[PDB]
Amino acid sequence: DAKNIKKGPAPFYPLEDGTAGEQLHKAMKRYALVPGTIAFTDAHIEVNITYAEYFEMSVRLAEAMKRYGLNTNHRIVVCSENSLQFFMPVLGALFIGVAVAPANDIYNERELLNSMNISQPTVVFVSKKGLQKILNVQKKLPIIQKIIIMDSKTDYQGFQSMYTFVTSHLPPGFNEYDFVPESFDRDKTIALIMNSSLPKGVALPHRTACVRFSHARDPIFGNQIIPDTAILSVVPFHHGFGMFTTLGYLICGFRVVLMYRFEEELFLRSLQDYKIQSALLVPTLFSFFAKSTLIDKYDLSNLHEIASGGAPLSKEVGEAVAKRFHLPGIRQGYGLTETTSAILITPEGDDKPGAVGKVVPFFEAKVVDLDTGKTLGVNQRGELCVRGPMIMSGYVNNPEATNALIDKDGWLHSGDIAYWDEDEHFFIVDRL
Numbered sequence: 219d220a221k222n223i224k225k226g227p228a229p230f231y232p233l234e235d236g237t238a239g240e241q242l243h244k245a246m247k248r249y250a251l252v253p254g255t256i257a258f259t260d261a262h263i264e265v266n267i268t269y270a271e272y273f274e275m276s277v278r279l280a281e282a283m284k285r286y287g288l289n290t291n292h293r294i295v296v297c298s299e300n301s302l303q304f305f306m307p308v309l310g311a312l313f314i315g316v317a318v319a320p321a322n323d324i325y326n327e328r329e330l331l332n333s334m335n336i337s338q339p340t341v342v343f344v345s346k347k348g349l350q351k352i353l354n355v356q357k358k359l360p361i362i363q364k365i366i367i368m369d370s371k372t373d374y375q376g377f378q379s380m381y382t383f384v385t386s387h388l389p390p391g392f393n394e395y396d397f398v399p400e401s402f403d404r405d406k407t408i409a410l411i412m413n414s415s416l417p418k419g420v421a422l423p424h425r426t427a428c429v430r431f432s433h434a435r436d437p438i439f440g441n442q443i444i445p446d447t448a449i450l451s452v453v454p455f456h457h458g459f460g461m462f463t464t465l466g467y468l469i470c471g472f473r474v475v476l477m478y479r480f481e482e483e484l485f486l487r488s489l490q491d492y493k494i495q496s497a498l499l500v501p502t503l504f505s506f507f508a509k510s511t512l513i514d515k516y517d518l519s520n521l522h523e524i525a526s527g528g529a530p531l532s533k534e535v536g537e538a539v540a541k542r543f544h545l546p547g548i549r550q551g552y553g554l555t556e557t558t559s560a561i562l563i564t565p566e567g568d569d570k571p572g573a574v575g576k577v578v579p580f581f582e583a584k585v586v587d588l589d590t591g592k593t594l595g596v597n598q599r600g601e602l603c604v605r606g607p608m609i610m611s612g613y614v615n616n617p618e619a620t621n622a623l624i625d626k627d628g629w630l631h632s633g634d635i636a637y638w639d640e641d642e643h644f645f646i647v648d649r650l
């Protein structure tokens with residue numbers, strides 16, 4: 219061993235009661251009441267949407283879906299590239315306890331089928347450009363009984379938009395600010411079904427998102443709740459990195475600036491013009507910005523951190539990127555789809571080259587001997603194992619693949635090789 223088991227410190231605020239939908243509802247209502255509070259900004263088209271707008275459309279979607287008949291026995295799919303509308307049905311469903319399975323908007327038809335065959339959605343929200351794939355998947359999966367278009371105001375090609383669907387199902391005199399999100403068992407009600415790294419379905423109870431919201435506004439393990447904080451996120455919303463940072467930024471009242479096609483100039487200009495304080499990159503963009511020479515042309519003085527996750531960041535490209543951006547280091551974190559979000563996180567300003575962080579509040583982490591199972595001590599390399607309240611509840615209708623991952627005592631076996639050091643910073647070893 220127990221000197222060799224690394225434990226998450228204490229959360230700076232304790233763990234809120236209520237479902238993830240109740241916690242989102244309460245914060246967003248608060249932001250909704252101050253006019254002009256920006257929730258999302260689309261860098262390509264330059265449009266802002268406020269928390270008032272976001273809050274009111276999510277509450278209406280929640281009530282419409284409820285009046286349509288969806289409940290905890292149901293799942294919806296959200297199949298769209300990152301967009302201003304992406305999170306409206308996501309929030310709507312969380313408010314009423316309907317599980318959300320976000321679908322890779324660039325899966326081809328076959329991966330979409332396999333994804334939605336596991337998720338078995340009753341309703342699909344889709345962007346215009348994904349409709350024809352969903353219609354082909356629907357032919358094979360008639361459990362899809364209702365298709366709603368996300369990025370339209372009017373009806374589109376015979377299908378309702380979110381806005382016409384909402385009107386079709388709101389009671390007269392619906393009041394967005396009197397709406398009360400559903401109360402339910404957060405341990406037992408699934409919030410998200412996420413796709414596995416042939417893909418599997420990862421069920422995440424509302425609880426795992428609630429713990430994530432603790433980290434997100436933790437001053438050491440998340441971000442400080444400070445007005446006019448803006449984040450430029452270039453990560454897919456349909457995977458856990460983008461899903462659970464974005465929901466955390468919404469809980470925090472941040473301005474989330476998005477882009478879904480990378481462009482060097484647009485990214486750098488958006489950093490500058492939106493006075494971005496924190497940038498979110500997928501790791502292959504780190505290899506890009508190690509090569510970019512245009513960074514010094516831009517006023518990046520507001521930039522406090524560049525965050526990384528989800529894949530291997532080497533000590534080399536990280537140091538290269540930090541220098542091109544004149545930052546102390548890279549702020550990094552480690553988790554799996556099966557782990558909700560990041561379980562190891564660089565504490566703010568406690569950055570170390572090559573390390574992905576320390577054990578987050580509520581969790582524990584060890585490295586075990588690849589042959590026996592016994593717990594190792596400082597700087598010994600073995601398998602990375604973790605345990606805590608963000609671990610998935612299981613794979614959708616795949617119990618053997620679940621139990622091959624978590625022992626009877628609840629340790630998730632990362633399948634990664636790791637060590638921790640004298641300050642308890644963790645390091646992931648590339649097997650190659």
Ligand SMILES: O=C(O)[C@H]1CSC(c2nc3ccc(N4CCCCCC4)cc3s2)=N1
Pocket residue numbers: 439440458459462463525526527528529549550551552553554555558559560563564
């Ligand atoms: O690679 C994966 O499978 C995915 C599963 S979810 C995940 C990560 N989620 C997150 C969520 C948050 C972060 N942070 C950015 C780094 C500094 C602040 C801590 C959160 C890093 C990661 S990495 N990576």
